[PDB]
Amino acid sequence: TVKVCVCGGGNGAHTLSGLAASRDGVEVRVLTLFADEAERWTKALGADELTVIVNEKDGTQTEVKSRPKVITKDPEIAISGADVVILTVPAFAHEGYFQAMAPYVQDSALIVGLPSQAGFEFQCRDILGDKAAAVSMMSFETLPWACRIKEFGRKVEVLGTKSVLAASLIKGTAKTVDPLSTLQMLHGAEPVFRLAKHFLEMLIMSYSFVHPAILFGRWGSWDGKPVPEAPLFYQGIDQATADMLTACSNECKDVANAIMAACPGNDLSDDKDIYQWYLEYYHEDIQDDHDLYHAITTNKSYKGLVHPVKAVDAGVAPDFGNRYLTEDIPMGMIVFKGVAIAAGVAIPSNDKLIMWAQEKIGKEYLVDGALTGKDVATTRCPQRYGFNTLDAILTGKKHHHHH
Ligand SMILES: NC(=O)C1=CN([C@@H]2O[C@H](COP(=O)(O)OP(=O)(O)OC[C@H]3O[C@@H](n4cnc5c(N)ncnc54)[C@H](O)[C@@H]3O)[C@@H](O)[C@H]2O)C=CC1
Ligand SMILES: N=C(N)NCCCCN
């Protein structure tokens, strides 16, 4: 039997619990530490099975029905004996699960971030301590599905499910169940999971700048004047924002190259241009792909997608807060900035974006190019956990003298 603990009670948690529990020889324990979400889910589901509606490419809908073994807020029941522990929650909830699982997680456990967001492994290492080197840490780029709960506890819809998805892996000393094939089995035929060469590649390939860039490209020098209605998001970018995304992406390559040169045996060559990335994973949706601007603006899976806005005098105004900034900055850009400092690589365009973004949401992470902001302890930059060197970042071991 493979024993999976699904952490969370969101769209993803519902879907993953639904899908994973439908597989033969799989036992699912749902863990959720959000107050009494666990009891609520339980009362709601009753004696029925959890239902997942999957929208196929045919336009048809397949119904998956299954039941988890237990739905609980008790980590001892959820984590003990678990072969795989999958965290599917907004990144701010990760700290709580790592803290809860710590004294119950076995050496052999595969600890999965679905999705991880940036700094997932640094946090995991810090919280689990000496147990971190034993377990394996798996980081997935994004969520496998586009999904929404329809009826809490008992029904979730997959609007679409990704064709391919990448994940990185830090192997522990303990032999886990096979990370890639086990995860694949839980998800079914799709996405077709591939293994990223190195976890830092996966972290950098998050392109945490993307959403901060887009918001800046449309609201950067915003004269305060309202607009009639929510402007297009991705499809609404101009040439300047495209260039900005190219600049940031290059800064990603810069950091990647610096690590490789300072640290032999760390293959980060799969860090590619955002433009080169778009064509790899959206080609069938892009009608005009001669450059990055056109690659993004003619992307058919970006149509109808608009900025978050709110009602103001004489029209509509950008709605910051959201998760483009409250997540992508502390759980994204800052982490990348932490690696950039450790590599010694300047990244003026990422910096430009951080400084602007944090002000919008009334947070402070970066000050004078240095990670000394008011709320820097709420981020996952490796420096926050005392991982200050590339070696510390890579291996999780601090230094270490010795009189
Ligand atoms: N289609 C989708 O739902 C997409 C979501 N994602 C990403 O995947 C991640 C998971 O997505 P969802 O499952 O939709 O997230 P969600 O927003 O549905 O998750 C809500 C869950 O977060 C936890 N939570 C909320 N407030 C909390 C609190 N203050 N303290 C402790 N726990 C709390 C609870 O368990 C709650 O059930 C997100 O980071 C999202 O950005 C990525 C692609 C698509
Ligand atoms: N890391 C990637 N390759 N893609 C990120 C998916 C977008 C999540 N906002």
Numbering used by the authors: 2 to 404
Q: What is the paper's account of this structure, in its own sentences?
A:
The enzyme consists of two domains, an NADH binding domain and a so-called octopine-binding domain. Furthermore, a catalytic dyad comprising a His–Asp proton relay system and an additional Arg-sensor (Arg324) were identified. In summary, substrates of OcDH bind in an ordered sequential manner.
Since no sequence assignment could be established in the NMR experiments, we solved the structure of the OcDH/NADH-Agmatine complex by X-ray crystallography. Already during the initial round of refinement after rigid body refinement and manual building it became obvious that agmatine is bound inside the structure in a fashion similar to L-arginine in the OcDH/NADH-L-arginine complex. The guanidinium headgroup of agmatine is coordinated via interactions with the side chains of Glu142 (domain I) and Trp278 (domain II) as well as backbone interactions with Met206 (domain II). The Cβ atom is bound via backbone interactions of Ser207. This is reflected in the RMSD value between the L-arginine and agmatine structure is 0.6 Å over 399 Cα atoms whereas the comparison with OcDH/NADH complex is 1.5 Å over 399 Cα atoms.
